[PDB]
Design a protein around this ligand. Structure first.
Ligand SMILES: Cc1nnc2c(NC3CCN(C)CC3)cc(C(=O)N3[C@H]4Cc5ccccc5[C@@H]3CNC4=O)nn12
Length: 130
């Protein structure tokens, strides 16, 4: 319905805003663009589902997220990819992991404080009906 399309439009606006706030955070610079195979050569073959904040924006705009839960699955993927690709004790690896965990925690904390749970419930019920 038209009221349902208004719901999903509000969801997209909310998701773009959260994503923009993560993207402008200096700690999350390495998550703002897809990992480049020329700069990180052993990546594209080891990480099956690459995910980053620009690809998240593209997915919002293509109407791929119908709930915050779907959006959070991709935020989780940015974090899980960094943990998987950088598992070593070395500082470089530990720094990416801390930044990935911090990006995930920040997205969840923003949504916990600003997302009305009845708004999410409505999105989930429209999604389940389709
Ligand atoms: C994500 C993600 N997951 N793991 C990594 C990582 N790992 C390092 C850990 C330490 N060892 C020794 C080398 C591999 C490095 C970068 C990274 O420094 N990037 C990425 C993504 C990106 C995006 C926007 C702006 C800057 C960057 C920089 C430069 N080019 C890249 O492709 N990202 N990354």
């Amino acid at each position: 319905s038209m009221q349902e399309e208004d719901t999903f439009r509000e969801l997209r606006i909310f998701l773009r805003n959260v994503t923009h706030r993560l993207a402008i955070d200096k700690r999350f610079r390495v998550f703002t663009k897809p990992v480049d195979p020329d700069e990180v050569p052993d990546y594209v073959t080891v990480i099956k589902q690459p995910m980053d904040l620009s690809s998240v924006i593209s997915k919002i705009d293509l109407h791929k997220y119908l709930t915050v839960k779907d959006y959070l699955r991709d935020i989780d993927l940015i974090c899980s990819n960094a943990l998987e690709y950088n598992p070593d004790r070395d500082p470089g690896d530990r720094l990416i992991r801390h930044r990935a965990c911090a990006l995930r925690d920040t997205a969840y904390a923003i949504i916990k404080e600003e997302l009305d749970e009845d708004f999410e419930q409505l999105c989930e019920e429209i999604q389940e009906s389709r």
